[model samples]
Target: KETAAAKFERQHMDSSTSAASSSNYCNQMMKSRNLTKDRCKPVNTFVHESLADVQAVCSQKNVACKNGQTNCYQSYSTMSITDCRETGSSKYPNCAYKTTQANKHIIVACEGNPYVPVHFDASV
Candidate 1:
Protein backbone atom coordinates (compact mmCIF):
# COMPACT_ATOMS: atom_id res chain seq x y z
CA LYS A 1 0.00 0.00 0.00
CA GLU A 2 1.26 3.47 -0.91
CA THR A 3 1.03 5.72 2.10
CA ALA A 4 0.54 9.46 1.93
CA ALA A 5 4.20 9.86 2.92
CA ALA A 6 5.26 7.84 -0.11
CA LYS A 7 3.02 9.82 -2.41
CA PHE A 8 4.42 13.03 -0.97
CA GLU A 9 7.92 11.89 -1.83
CA ARG A 10 6.99 11.02 -5.40
CA GLN A 11 5.35 14.37 -5.87
CA HIS A 12 7.81 16.64 -4.08
CA MET A 13 11.30 15.25 -3.42
CA ASP A 14 14.21 15.97 -5.78
CA SER A 15 17.32 15.92 -3.64
CA SER A 16 19.76 14.67 -6.25
CA THR A 17 19.55 17.64 -8.56
CA SER A 18 19.93 21.41 -8.27
CA ALA A 19 19.03 22.23 -11.82
CA ALA A 20 16.05 24.34 -10.93
CA SER A 21 17.41 27.14 -13.11
CA SER A 22 17.10 25.05 -16.23
CA SER A 23 14.22 26.18 -18.38
CA ASN A 24 13.07 22.61 -19.00
CA TYR A 25 13.50 21.37 -15.46
CA CYS A 26 9.80 21.40 -14.65
CA ASN A 27 8.81 20.09 -18.08
CA GLN A 28 11.14 17.10 -17.87
CA MET A 29 10.76 16.38 -14.18
CA MET A 30 6.96 16.59 -14.13
CA LYS A 31 6.80 14.12 -17.02
CA SER A 32 9.52 11.72 -15.88
CA ARG A 33 8.01 11.67 -12.41
CA ASN A 34 4.63 10.73 -14.00
CA LEU A 35 2.94 13.86 -12.72
CA THR A 36 1.97 14.85 -16.23
CA LYS A 37 0.61 11.51 -17.36
CA ASP A 38 -3.13 12.19 -17.41
CA ARG A 39 -3.57 15.91 -16.83
CA CYS A 40 -1.31 18.80 -15.88
CA LYS A 41 -1.12 19.35 -12.17
CA PRO A 42 -2.14 22.97 -11.75
CA VAL A 43 0.76 23.63 -9.41
CA ASN A 44 3.45 21.61 -7.68
CA THR A 45 6.72 21.97 -5.77
CA PHE A 46 10.01 20.10 -5.56
CA VAL A 47 12.22 20.32 -2.50
CA HIS A 48 15.96 20.12 -3.17
CA GLU A 49 16.89 18.93 0.30
CA SER A 50 17.89 15.46 1.43
CA LEU A 51 15.27 13.08 2.82
CA ALA A 52 16.88 13.26 6.25
CA ASP A 53 16.69 17.03 6.25
CA VAL A 54 13.08 17.02 5.15
CA GLN A 55 12.12 14.34 7.66
CA ALA A 56 13.58 16.49 10.41
CA VAL A 57 10.85 19.01 9.76
CA CYS A 58 8.35 16.59 11.28
CA SER A 59 9.91 17.27 14.67
CA GLN A 60 10.12 21.04 14.24
CA LYS A 61 7.80 23.69 15.63
CA ASN A 62 4.12 23.00 15.24
CA VAL A 63 2.04 25.15 12.95
CA ALA A 64 -1.50 25.39 11.62
CA CYS A 65 -2.22 23.81 8.24
CA LYS A 66 -4.07 25.61 5.47
CA ASN A 67 -7.25 23.69 6.30
CA GLY A 68 -6.95 24.60 10.02
CA GLN A 69 -5.35 21.28 10.99
CA THR A 70 -2.79 21.50 13.78
CA ASN A 71 -0.66 18.59 12.57
CA CYS A 72 1.63 20.77 10.48
CA TYR A 73 5.25 21.61 11.29
CA GLN A 74 7.41 24.40 9.95
CA SER A 75 11.10 23.99 9.18
CA TYR A 76 13.53 26.17 11.09
CA SER A 77 16.02 26.32 8.24
CA THR A 78 15.23 27.68 4.82
CA MET A 79 15.60 25.20 1.98
CA SER A 80 16.01 25.31 -1.76
CA ILE A 81 12.88 24.58 -3.74
CA THR A 82 11.29 24.91 -7.14
CA ASP A 83 7.67 25.63 -7.96
CA CYS A 84 6.07 24.29 -11.11
CA ARG A 85 2.93 25.96 -12.39
CA GLU A 86 0.88 25.22 -15.46
CA THR A 87 1.14 27.59 -18.40
CA GLY A 88 -1.89 29.07 -20.06
CA SER A 89 -1.75 26.69 -23.01
CA SER A 90 -1.29 23.56 -20.93
CA LYS A 91 -3.63 20.66 -21.68
CA TYR A 92 -4.06 17.01 -20.81
CA PRO A 93 -1.22 14.70 -21.91
CA ASN A 94 0.75 17.77 -22.95
CA CYS A 95 1.34 19.42 -19.64
CA ALA A 96 3.41 22.56 -19.69
CA TYR A 97 4.91 24.26 -16.67
CA LYS A 98 6.71 27.45 -15.73
CA THR A 99 9.37 26.95 -13.09
CA THR A 100 10.30 29.30 -10.28
CA GLN A 101 13.00 28.66 -7.69
CA ALA A 102 13.37 29.95 -4.16
CA ASN A 103 14.71 29.32 -0.68
CA LYS A 104 12.21 29.33 2.17
CA HIS A 105 11.08 27.64 5.34
CA ILE A 106 8.67 24.84 4.48
CA ILE A 107 5.56 23.68 6.27
CA VAL A 108 4.27 20.12 6.09
CA ALA A 109 1.63 17.94 7.67
CA CYS A 110 2.81 14.91 9.62
CA GLU A 111 1.18 11.74 10.94
CA GLY A 112 1.63 8.25 12.44
CA ASN A 113 3.73 6.99 15.34
CA PRO A 114 7.12 7.73 13.82
CA TYR A 115 5.77 11.12 12.70
CA VAL A 116 6.72 11.95 9.12
CA PRO A 117 5.65 14.42 6.50
CA VAL A 118 2.52 13.38 4.64
CA HIS A 119 1.74 16.57 2.77
CA PHE A 120 3.37 19.88 1.78
CA ASP A 121 1.23 22.66 3.22
CA ALA A 122 3.23 25.77 2.33
CA SER A 123 6.61 27.59 2.20
CA VAL A 124 7.42 30.89 3.85
Candidate 2:
Protein backbone atom coordinates (compact mmCIF):
# COMPACT_ATOMS: atom_id res chain seq x y z
CA LYS A 1 0.00 0.00 0.00
CA GLU A 2 1.35 3.39 -1.05
CA THR A 3 0.34 6.97 -0.29
CA ALA A 4 -0.65 9.55 -2.91
CA ALA A 5 2.42 11.56 -2.03
CA ALA A 6 4.56 8.51 -2.64
CA LYS A 7 2.98 7.98 -6.05
CA PHE A 8 3.65 11.59 -6.99
CA GLU A 9 7.23 11.14 -5.88
CA ARG A 10 7.71 8.00 -7.90
CA GLN A 11 6.48 9.59 -11.13
CA HIS A 12 7.66 13.17 -10.82
CA MET A 13 10.76 12.35 -8.85
CA ASP A 14 12.93 14.02 -11.43
CA SER A 15 11.56 17.42 -10.52
CA SER A 16 13.07 17.49 -7.09
CA THR A 17 14.89 14.63 -5.32
CA SER A 18 16.70 17.58 -3.78
CA ALA A 19 16.45 17.81 -0.01
CA ALA A 20 16.64 14.11 0.78
CA SER A 21 18.00 12.39 -2.27
CA SER A 22 21.31 13.67 -3.63
CA SER A 23 19.90 14.14 -7.10
CA ASN A 24 17.66 17.25 -7.42
CA TYR A 25 20.73 19.34 -8.05
CA CYS A 26 24.42 18.90 -8.72
CA ASN A 27 26.93 18.67 -5.86
CA GLN A 28 27.23 22.43 -5.52
CA MET A 29 23.44 22.87 -5.41
CA MET A 30 23.16 20.00 -2.94
CA LYS A 31 25.57 21.73 -0.54
CA SER A 32 23.74 24.99 -0.98
CA ARG A 33 20.44 23.20 -0.40
CA ASN A 34 21.50 22.30 3.14
CA LEU A 35 22.28 25.94 3.85
CA THR A 36 18.83 27.12 2.81
CA LYS A 37 15.52 26.23 4.44
CA ASP A 38 13.99 27.12 1.12
CA ARG A 39 16.05 24.21 -0.22
CA CYS A 40 13.06 22.93 -2.15
CA LYS A 41 9.34 22.56 -1.79
CA PRO A 42 9.10 19.47 0.31
CA VAL A 43 8.39 16.44 -1.83
CA ASN A 44 5.86 15.53 0.80
CA THR A 45 3.14 17.51 -0.95
CA PHE A 46 -0.61 17.25 -0.58
CA VAL A 47 -1.97 17.04 -4.09
CA HIS A 48 -5.53 15.72 -4.35
CA GLU A 49 -3.92 12.85 -6.23
CA SER A 50 -6.83 11.93 -8.52
CA LEU A 51 -10.50 11.05 -8.25
CA ALA A 52 -9.72 7.60 -9.56
CA ASP A 53 -6.86 7.31 -7.12
CA VAL A 54 -9.02 8.32 -4.21
CA GLN A 55 -12.02 6.24 -5.26
CA ALA A 56 -9.85 3.20 -5.73
CA VAL A 57 -8.30 3.61 -2.31
CA CYS A 58 -11.54 4.40 -0.54
CA SER A 59 -13.27 1.45 -2.19
CA GLN A 60 -10.49 -0.89 -1.21
CA LYS A 61 -9.82 0.86 2.12
CA ASN A 62 -6.13 0.81 1.45
CA VAL A 63 -3.33 3.23 0.90
CA ALA A 64 -2.62 3.77 -2.79
CA CYS A 65 -0.17 5.64 -4.94
CA LYS A 66 -1.27 7.73 -7.94
CA ASN A 67 0.97 9.44 -10.47
CA GLY A 68 1.11 13.12 -11.54
CA GLN A 69 3.05 15.52 -13.80
CA THR A 70 6.47 17.03 -13.06
CA ASN A 71 5.00 20.28 -11.69
CA CYS A 72 1.48 21.41 -10.96
CA TYR A 73 -0.40 23.38 -13.60
CA GLN A 74 -1.25 27.04 -13.18
CA SER A 75 -1.49 29.99 -15.56
CA TYR A 76 1.97 29.17 -16.93
CA SER A 77 2.83 25.48 -16.95
CA THR A 78 4.03 22.86 -19.49
CA MET A 79 4.54 19.10 -19.84
CA SER A 80 6.40 16.57 -21.99
CA ILE A 81 6.84 12.81 -22.34
CA THR A 82 8.08 10.07 -24.68
CA ASP A 83 6.29 7.15 -23.13
CA CYS A 84 3.26 5.82 -24.97
CA ARG A 85 1.46 4.90 -21.78
CA GLU A 86 1.75 8.47 -20.63
CA THR A 87 -0.14 10.93 -22.86
CA GLY A 88 2.38 13.21 -21.28
CA SER A 89 -0.71 14.03 -19.31
CA SER A 90 -1.13 14.71 -15.66
CA LYS A 91 -2.48 11.53 -14.15
CA TYR A 92 -4.60 13.82 -11.97
CA PRO A 93 -7.00 16.56 -13.04
CA ASN A 94 -9.24 19.13 -11.32
CA CYS A 95 -12.34 16.94 -11.69
CA ALA A 96 -12.59 16.03 -8.05
CA TYR A 97 -13.41 19.50 -6.82
CA LYS A 98 -16.34 21.69 -7.78
CA THR A 99 -15.89 25.37 -8.42
CA THR A 100 -16.56 27.27 -5.21
CA GLN A 101 -15.34 30.20 -3.22
CA ALA A 102 -12.83 27.86 -1.67
CA ASN A 103 -11.59 26.62 -5.02
CA LYS A 104 -11.92 28.68 -8.16
CA HIS A 105 -9.33 29.07 -10.90
CA ILE A 106 -8.05 25.60 -10.18
CA ILE A 107 -4.94 24.53 -11.99
CA VAL A 108 -4.77 21.57 -14.37
CA ALA A 109 -1.50 20.05 -15.53
CA CYS A 110 -2.38 18.95 -19.04
CA GLU A 111 -0.01 17.36 -21.58
CA GLY A 112 0.23 19.87 -24.39
CA ASN A 113 0.41 23.52 -25.32
CA PRO A 114 -3.36 23.74 -25.64
CA TYR A 115 -4.26 24.31 -22.01
CA VAL A 116 -7.98 24.46 -21.31
CA PRO A 117 -10.39 25.80 -18.75
CA VAL A 118 -11.74 22.48 -17.42
CA HIS A 119 -15.11 23.67 -16.22
CA PHE A 120 -16.40 21.40 -13.54
CA ASP A 121 -17.58 24.69 -12.09
CA ALA A 122 -21.04 24.48 -13.64
CA SER A 123 -22.17 21.86 -11.14
CA VAL A 124 -23.90 23.05 -8.02
Candidate 3:
Protein backbone atom coordinates (compact mmCIF):
# COMPACT_ATOMS: atom_id res chain seq x y z
CA LYS A 1 0.00 0.00 0.00
CA GLU A 2 1.15 3.54 -0.67
CA THR A 3 1.98 5.59 2.38
CA ALA A 4 0.21 8.88 2.91
CA ALA A 5 3.40 10.92 2.56
CA ALA A 6 4.38 9.01 -0.56
CA LYS A 7 0.97 9.50 -2.10
CA PHE A 8 1.15 13.21 -1.35
CA GLU A 9 4.49 13.46 -3.13
CA ARG A 10 3.02 11.80 -6.17
CA GLN A 11 -0.31 13.67 -6.39
CA HIS A 12 0.80 17.10 -5.26
CA MET A 13 4.53 17.76 -5.63
CA ASP A 14 6.04 19.00 -8.87
CA SER A 15 9.17 20.96 -8.05
CA SER A 16 10.28 21.67 -11.61
CA THR A 17 7.48 23.56 -13.32
CA SER A 18 7.91 27.33 -13.03
CA ALA A 19 5.52 28.98 -15.45
CA ALA A 20 3.86 26.01 -17.11
CA SER A 21 4.35 26.48 -20.82
CA SER A 22 2.38 23.59 -22.25
CA SER A 23 -1.05 22.11 -21.72
CA ASN A 24 0.77 18.80 -21.71
CA TYR A 25 2.09 19.58 -18.25
CA CYS A 26 -0.91 18.19 -16.48
CA ASN A 27 -1.86 15.67 -19.12
CA GLN A 28 1.53 14.09 -19.03
CA MET A 29 1.95 14.32 -15.29
CA MET A 30 -1.43 13.04 -14.24
CA LYS A 31 -0.77 9.86 -16.19
CA SER A 32 2.95 9.49 -15.65
CA ARG A 33 2.38 9.83 -11.93
CA ASN A 34 -0.30 7.12 -11.92
CA LEU A 35 -3.17 9.52 -11.14
CA THR A 36 -4.75 8.72 -14.48
CA LYS A 37 -4.58 4.93 -14.28
CA ASP A 38 -7.91 4.41 -12.57
CA ARG A 39 -9.74 7.66 -13.23
CA CYS A 40 -8.66 11.24 -13.62
CA LYS A 41 -8.62 13.04 -10.33
CA PRO A 42 -11.26 15.69 -10.89
CA VAL A 43 -9.15 18.44 -9.31
CA ASN A 44 -5.63 18.25 -8.10
CA THR A 45 -2.75 20.58 -7.28
CA PHE A 46 0.99 20.52 -7.80
CA VAL A 47 3.24 22.55 -5.59
CA HIS A 48 6.26 24.02 -7.36
CA GLU A 49 8.30 24.34 -4.20
CA SER A 50 10.63 22.24 -2.15
CA LEU A 51 9.36 19.19 -0.32
CA ALA A 52 10.67 20.72 2.90
CA ASP A 53 8.68 23.90 2.36
CA VAL A 54 5.54 21.90 1.69
CA GLN A 55 6.11 19.80 4.75
CA ALA A 56 6.67 22.93 6.80
CA VAL A 57 3.07 23.85 6.14
CA CYS A 58 2.08 21.32 8.78
CA SER A 59 3.61 23.65 11.37
CA GLN A 60 2.18 26.90 10.05
CA LYS A 61 -1.34 26.97 11.39
CA ASN A 62 -4.44 24.89 11.81
CA VAL A 63 -7.46 24.87 9.53
CA ALA A 64 -10.56 22.81 8.85
CA CYS A 65 -10.43 20.56 5.84
CA LYS A 66 -13.12 21.01 3.23
CA ASN A 67 -14.17 17.39 3.72
CA GLY A 68 -14.27 18.01 7.47
CA GLN A 69 -11.17 15.98 8.29
CA THR A 70 -9.38 17.08 11.44
CA ASN A 71 -5.70 17.10 10.42
CA CYS A 72 -5.52 20.15 8.26
CA TYR A 73 -3.03 23.04 8.05
CA GLN A 74 -2.61 26.27 6.12
CA SER A 75 0.51 27.87 4.77
CA TYR A 76 1.52 31.26 6.16
CA SER A 77 2.69 32.65 2.80
CA THR A 78 1.56 32.43 -0.77
CA MET A 79 3.36 29.74 -2.70
CA SER A 80 3.80 28.83 -6.32
CA ILE A 81 1.36 26.17 -7.42
CA THR A 82 -0.33 24.71 -10.47
CA ASP A 83 -3.94 23.71 -10.30
CA CYS A 84 -4.98 20.82 -12.55
CA ARG A 85 -8.64 20.70 -13.38
CA GLU A 86 -10.03 17.89 -15.45
CA THR A 87 -11.52 19.26 -18.63
CA GLY A 88 -15.05 18.48 -19.73
CA SER A 89 -13.67 16.51 -22.63
CA SER A 90 -11.47 14.50 -20.35
CA LYS A 91 -11.93 10.75 -20.62
CA TYR A 92 -10.52 7.90 -18.57
CA PRO A 93 -7.52 6.81 -20.64
CA ASN A 94 -7.13 10.21 -22.26
CA CYS A 95 -7.47 12.28 -19.15
CA ALA A 96 -6.96 15.94 -20.02
CA TYR A 97 -6.52 18.82 -17.63
CA LYS A 98 -6.31 22.58 -17.50
CA THR A 99 -3.25 23.88 -15.75
CA THR A 100 -3.44 27.21 -13.98
CA GLN A 101 -0.61 28.79 -12.07
CA ALA A 102 -1.07 31.03 -9.06
CA ASN A 103 0.51 32.25 -5.89
CA LYS A 104 -1.67 31.53 -2.92
CA HIS A 105 -1.70 30.24 0.60
CA ILE A 106 -2.57 26.53 0.51
CA ILE A 107 -4.56 24.33 2.81
CA VAL A 108 -3.59 20.66 3.24
CA ALA A 109 -4.47 17.67 5.33
CA CYS A 110 -1.60 16.18 7.33
CA GLU A 111 -1.02 12.73 8.75
CA GLY A 112 1.49 10.00 9.70
CA ASN A 113 4.58 9.69 11.87
CA PRO A 114 6.16 13.04 11.00
CA TYR A 115 2.79 14.73 10.47
CA VAL A 116 3.37 15.47 6.80
CA PRO A 117 0.88 16.48 4.14
CA VAL A 118 -1.52 13.85 2.90
CA HIS A 119 -4.05 15.74 0.80
CA PHE A 120 -4.29 19.16 -0.82
CA ASP A 121 -7.40 20.91 0.43
CA ALA A 122 -7.45 24.25 -1.37
CA SER A 123 -5.59 27.47 -2.14
CA VAL A 124 -6.61 30.93 -1.02
Candidate 4:
Protein backbone atom coordinates (compact mmCIF):
# COMPACT_ATOMS: atom_id res chain seq x y z
CA LYS A 1 0.00 0.00 0.00
CA GLU A 2 1.19 3.52 -0.79
CA THR A 3 1.55 5.72 2.24
CA ALA A 4 -0.05 9.15 2.18
CA ALA A 5 3.34 10.83 2.54
CA ALA A 6 4.66 8.84 -0.41
CA LYS A 7 1.62 9.70 -2.46
CA PHE A 8 2.15 13.38 -1.68
CA GLU A 9 5.71 13.17 -2.93
CA ARG A 10 4.69 11.46 -6.13
CA GLN A 11 1.98 13.98 -6.91
CA HIS A 12 3.72 17.18 -5.83
CA MET A 13 7.49 16.86 -5.58
CA ASP A 14 9.86 17.73 -8.43
CA SER A 15 13.17 18.72 -6.87
CA SER A 16 15.40 18.50 -9.93
CA THR A 17 13.40 19.76 -12.87
CA SER A 18 12.57 23.43 -13.13
CA ALA A 19 9.51 24.25 -15.23
CA ALA A 20 10.66 27.83 -15.82
CA SER A 21 12.31 27.03 -19.13
CA SER A 22 9.77 24.68 -20.60
CA SER A 23 6.31 25.55 -21.86
CA ASN A 24 5.57 21.83 -22.18
CA TYR A 25 6.66 21.16 -18.62
CA CYS A 26 3.17 20.57 -17.31
CA ASN A 27 2.12 18.53 -20.32
CA GLN A 28 5.00 16.12 -19.87
CA MET A 29 5.14 16.15 -16.08
CA MET A 30 1.42 15.73 -15.54
CA LYS A 31 1.43 12.68 -17.79
CA SER A 32 4.60 11.13 -16.45
CA ARG A 33 3.50 11.66 -12.87
CA ASN A 34 0.24 9.85 -13.59
CA LEU A 35 -1.90 12.86 -12.82
CA THR A 36 -3.59 12.47 -16.20
CA LYS A 37 -4.62 8.85 -15.93
CA ASP A 38 -8.38 8.45 -15.52
CA ARG A 39 -9.06 12.16 -15.39
CA CYS A 40 -7.13 15.38 -15.64
CA LYS A 41 -6.20 17.09 -12.41
CA PRO A 42 -7.58 20.59 -12.75
CA VAL A 43 -4.84 22.20 -10.69
CA ASN A 44 -1.64 20.92 -9.11
CA THR A 45 1.61 22.36 -7.83
CA PHE A 46 5.07 20.85 -7.86
CA VAL A 47 7.55 21.79 -5.16
CA HIS A 48 11.06 22.24 -6.45
CA GLU A 49 12.76 21.35 -3.21
CA SER A 50 14.24 18.39 -1.44
CA LEU A 51 12.15 15.77 0.33
CA ALA A 52 13.82 16.55 3.63
CA ASP A 53 13.04 20.25 3.32
CA VAL A 54 9.37 19.67 2.55
CA GLN A 55 9.01 17.06 5.26
CA ALA A 56 10.31 19.64 7.72
CA VAL A 57 7.28 21.80 7.01
CA CYS A 58 5.33 19.42 9.17
CA SER A 59 7.14 20.91 12.10
CA GLN A 60 6.35 24.51 11.16
CA LYS A 61 3.60 26.57 12.71
CA ASN A 62 0.26 24.79 12.57
CA VAL A 63 -2.57 26.23 10.51
CA ALA A 64 -6.06 25.21 9.53
CA CYS A 65 -6.23 23.09 6.43
CA LYS A 66 -8.57 23.89 3.57
CA ASN A 67 -11.05 21.47 5.14
CA GLY A 68 -10.55 23.14 8.55
CA GLN A 69 -8.23 20.49 9.88
CA THR A 70 -5.50 21.66 12.30
CA ASN A 71 -2.70 19.46 11.09
CA CYS A 72 -1.67 21.77 8.29
CA TYR A 73 1.50 23.88 8.33
CA GLN A 74 2.84 26.60 6.09
CA SER A 75 6.46 26.81 5.10
CA TYR A 76 8.45 29.56 6.81
CA SER A 77 10.33 30.41 3.65
CA THR A 78 9.27 30.84 0.06
CA MET A 79 10.14 27.91 -2.15
CA SER A 80 10.40 27.37 -5.89
CA ILE A 81 7.27 25.82 -7.36
CA THR A 82 5.47 25.13 -10.57
CA ASP A 83 1.72 25.41 -10.78
CA CYS A 84 0.04 23.31 -13.43
CA ARG A 85 -3.48 24.07 -14.48
CA GLU A 86 -5.47 22.28 -17.11
CA THR A 87 -6.10 24.40 -20.22
CA GLY A 88 -9.70 25.24 -21.16
CA SER A 89 -9.74 22.75 -24.01
CA SER A 90 -7.96 19.98 -22.10
CA LYS A 91 -9.69 16.62 -22.09
CA TYR A 92 -9.37 13.43 -20.13
CA PRO A 93 -6.67 10.94 -21.20
CA ASN A 94 -5.04 13.69 -23.20
CA CYS A 95 -4.82 16.32 -20.50
CA ALA A 96 -3.16 19.56 -21.48
CA TYR A 97 -1.80 21.98 -18.91
CA LYS A 98 -0.25 25.44 -18.64
CA THR A 99 2.69 25.72 -16.28
CA THR A 100 3.53 28.75 -14.22
CA GLN A 101 6.69 28.86 -12.15
CA ALA A 102 6.94 30.93 -9.04
CA ASN A 103 8.26 31.17 -5.52
CA LYS A 104 5.74 30.91 -2.75
CA HIS A 105 5.09 29.63 0.72
CA ILE A 106 3.48 26.22 0.66
CA ILE A 107 0.89 24.80 2.98
CA VAL A 108 0.62 21.07 3.57
CA ALA A 109 -1.24 18.66 5.79
CA CYS A 110 0.85 16.31 7.85
CA GLU A 111 0.22 13.02 9.65
CA GLY A 112 1.71 9.76 10.97
CA ASN A 113 4.19 9.16 13.76
CA PRO A 114 6.99 10.97 11.98
CA TYR A 115 4.68 13.86 11.18
CA VAL A 116 5.51 14.07 7.51
CA PRO A 117 3.55 15.94 4.85
CA VAL A 118 0.74 13.88 3.40
CA HIS A 119 -1.32 16.40 1.50
CA PHE A 120 -0.60 19.64 -0.34
CA ASP A 121 -3.20 22.10 0.89
CA ALA A 122 -2.25 25.32 -0.90
CA SER A 123 0.41 27.91 -1.77
CA VAL A 124 0.62 31.52 -0.73
Best by TM-score: 4
- Model 2 Cα shift for residue 36 (angstroms): 38
TM-score of 4: 0.96
lDDT for each residue of candidate 3 in 36-112, tens digit (9 for 90 to 100) = 88888899888888899999999988988998877899999999988889999988878899988889899999887
Instruction: Give the range of the ten consecutive residues with the poorest summed lDDT in model 3.
Output: 15-24
TM-score of candidate 2 versus the correct structure, residues matched by position: 0.20
Number of colliding residue pairs in each model: 0, 0, 0, 0
Candidate 3: pairs in clash: none
Root mean square deviation (Cα) for candidate 2? 17.7
- Model 1 has how many clashing residue pairs? 0
Can you give the lDDT of residue 7 in candidate 1? 91
Segments in model 2 whose C-alpha atoms lie over 4 Å from true places: 16-75, 86-124
Question: What lDDT tens digits, residue by residue, belong to model 1 across residues 12-98?
Answer: 999998649697899988998888877888888899999999999999989899999999999999999998999999888788899
**Per-model C-alpha lDDT, please?**
0.91, 0.24, 0.87, 0.91
Estimate the Cα RMSD of every predicted model relative to the unseen true structure: 1.1, 17.7, 1.3, 1.0
**Candidate 1 segments whose C-alpha is farther than 4 A from its true place:** none
Question: Model 4 residue 112 lDDT?
Answer: 94
